[PDB]
Amino acid sequence: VYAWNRKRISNCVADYSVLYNLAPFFTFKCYGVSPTKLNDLCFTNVYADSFVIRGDEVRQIAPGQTGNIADYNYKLPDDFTGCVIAWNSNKLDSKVSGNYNYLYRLFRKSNLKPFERDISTEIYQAGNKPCNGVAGFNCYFPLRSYSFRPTYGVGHQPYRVVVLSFELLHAPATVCGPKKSTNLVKNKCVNFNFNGLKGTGVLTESNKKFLPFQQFGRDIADTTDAVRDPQTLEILDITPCSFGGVSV
Amino acid sequence: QVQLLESGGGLVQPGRSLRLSCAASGFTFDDYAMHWVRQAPGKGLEWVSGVSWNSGTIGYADSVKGRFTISRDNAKNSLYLHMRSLRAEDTALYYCAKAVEMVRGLGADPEYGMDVWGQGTTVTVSS
Amino acid sequence: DIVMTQSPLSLPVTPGEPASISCRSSQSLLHSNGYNYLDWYLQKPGQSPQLLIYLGSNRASGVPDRFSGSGSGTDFTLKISRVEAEDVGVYYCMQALQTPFTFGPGTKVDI
Amino acid sequence: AYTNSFTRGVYYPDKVFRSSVLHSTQDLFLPFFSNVTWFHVKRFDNPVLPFNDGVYFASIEKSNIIRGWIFGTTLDSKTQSLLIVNNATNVVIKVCEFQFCNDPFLDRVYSSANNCTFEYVSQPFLMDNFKNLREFVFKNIDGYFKIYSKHTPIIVEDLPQGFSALEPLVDLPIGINITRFQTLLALHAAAYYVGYLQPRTFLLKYNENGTITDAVDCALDPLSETKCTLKSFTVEKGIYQTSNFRVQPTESIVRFPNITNLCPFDEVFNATRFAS
Ligand SMILES: *[C@@H]1O[C@H](CO)[C@@H](O)[C@H](O)[C@H]1NC(C)=O
Ligand SMILES: *[C@@H]1O[C@H](CO)[C@@H](O)[C@H](O)[C@H]1NC(C)=O
Q: Which positions fall inside the BetaCoV S1-CTD domain (chain A)?
């Protein structure tokens, strides 16, 4: 948690549906946005911070909290617009004799600034004698090791945390979703959408040849007349069903 | 070309600290699990510590457990090894090696294959 | 906490013949995938060591086709199809399964 | 050297297809019969050039001599810089704070690549008895760095007399500031041309197949403006009204009274007392 890892995400389509369908990820406390609703949204960058904490400490991973974790290890800002996912890691994180592979910063002269990382190990001088780099009276090493054990109590059993931040920059959004997009019919008017365009028409087959990059079609009178089918690249037509006034 | 440069050597008395640093240059530093391997003077090699692709340590040697502390930084492409309770029996060369299999390229994640080795430092302890 | 041994402890080889070295373990390294995790490394004297074989028998990159690796269970062997003047030094076998990792005492090959 | 680029640098403004119609687009183009600078290398012709709004970077060569481009604003790794390199049978578009070398060459010679926020690999852009011409409109908008391209087998300097519409080869969402550029070259002659694009109206003639077969620089000469206004490539005998003569202002004069006394806003806003 003191040396929390940060994976930056870019240029992909995230099937949030994938983790949103797994009970192991029980703690899905998210602030600033709804998960169902953001699967139809796009951000420039996404950041994935992960680390392992004890069982009841999951609460500190939330905006405006205090404690060893939030003050010295992983602080979220007051104005946080992402999610926190946490699940028990009694799978392999714990060992019979204990895994000396986890540390939590215990002392630090100052609370973190949000999303700040501190991996520097310099004795915490609490007295007024310099410590010179050896632990002793009023001279404390910064980190300590969690005694993860299989029989440990739930509040002290293992726990992984994944923290999703979403940012919006003037840069084009490199992150989106698949949005369950496959359907095609012919010779019947349908509220058809092809990657963003709308309309209704009897979409048939065209003898007309696009160029490989060209997407839409037009006439002398700024009317859409052909849409290349994105999945099976073919030239369609567009014609709304018959209209015209009736006359008695 | 791939370069692994380490620094931090020098005579230090017993009962102090040191901070060895290994810097990598020439590859995507976040798809390779680093390792720190000692080399006693005129003896065989001996694994010391390691770190996976996600900054998650993979345990230390049985006789060294308790003092050494590894840390990584993908932003600066830097791996560091804080050393505590230095004793006379800790004098040796120290190489920082890199794994071979890039992660998710094929069961589990890879950790074997120390292929590229920098020229180690010459840490020593005496009074 | 796995202890490995090598044999022979030290053998003299002459340029133009094959040689065979055996590494033995305590617990068979057959993983669930079916792969042995033992690795063979050559530490040339006066120079940093270099990789020879990874994943039991999959030949490493950039080394010539004169080396062969075989074995399974708790016994593995490395055979130099043809030995030459540039194959002298120390050889080690290192586990890649139950952490911490371990390195054999080392075989000393000379002329 | 200065060459007259007669009618070249026309690209498809948008991904919309049209057939047998005329269309008056208004986008950044290379004006017809514009004077473009000309560099030919064993002369020293790898300078640093400005990126005003875009470039019609062409290249005339015998065999695969031009192989890359540098982009950026300060080009010293302090800010995000861009790179486009064509490998032997691959293309590499990376945007890294690379410390660049004075004279790059080929057998990495910049010798430094820092943190990279964007990578891209694809089939080579610069594919291969006749001198090749390879046009590229390196135009960037609102972050989207766009590239267009064509290949032309020129029969053995000066740009050819012919019309060919560049196609959009790729579009890229980098999103950085760009002010300068310079070509990349392999040490071990050939020439490359660079124009400049400024906003200009064009009339685009789409053919039956949808390939742009002709164009008219709208603000080039009177006849061009009549063809624009009529929206046709031919005009009949007659008198047509096109535009409006307007004399332009010369300088900007300003006249305010020369009383300058600091104003008592302290008693207004920062007063100690505010009445009922
Ligand atoms: C367009 O392509 C078709 C393909 O059959 C070809 O016949 C035609 O000649 C091309 N364009 C024209 C009208 O020249
Ligand atoms: C502007 O300057 C002239 C000096 O020639 C002075 O006579 C006049 O009073 C000035 N006007 C004001 C409003 O101060």
A: 1-178
Instruction: Say whether A214 and D21 touch across the interface (CB within 8 A).
Output: no
Resolution of the experimental model in angstroms, please?
3.0
- Token readout for C107 is 């075989």
CA of D209 to the centre of ligand 1 (A): 6
Residue nearest to atom 8 of ligand 1 (CA): D209
Of all residues in chain B, the one with the smallest CA distance to A51 is: B56
Q: Is D257 in the pocket of ligand 2 (CB under 6 A)?
A: yes
Exposed e or buried b per residue across D203-215, where buried means at least 16 C-beta atoms within 10 angstroms of its C-beta = bbbbeeebbbeeb
Closest chain D C-alpha to A2 CA, distance in angstroms: 23
Looking at CATH, the fold of the domain delimited by D1-245 is given as: Jelly Rolls (2.60.120)
Dist. CA D147–CA D57, nearest whole Å = 10
Query: CB D209 to CB A209 under 8 A?
Result: yes
- Any ligand 2 atom below 6 A from CB of D259: yes
- Per the structure block, which two tokens stand in for A32? 């600033």
Q: Which domains does chain B carry?
A: 3-125 (2.60.40.10)
Which of A133, A134, A104 has the alpha carbon at shortest distance from A3?
Answer: A104
CA distance A215 to chain D (A): 6
Determine the Cα–Cα distance for residues A115 and A106; give it in Å rounded to an integer.
17
Strands, E assignment, A5-159: 5-9, 12-13, 45-52, 83-87, 103-105, 124-125, 139-140, 143-145
Nearest residue to A120 (alpha-carbon basis) of A44, A128, A112:
A112
Experimental method reported for this structure: cryo-EM
Question: In chain B, which residues have their Cβ closer than 8 Å to the Cβ of A101?
Answer: 56-59
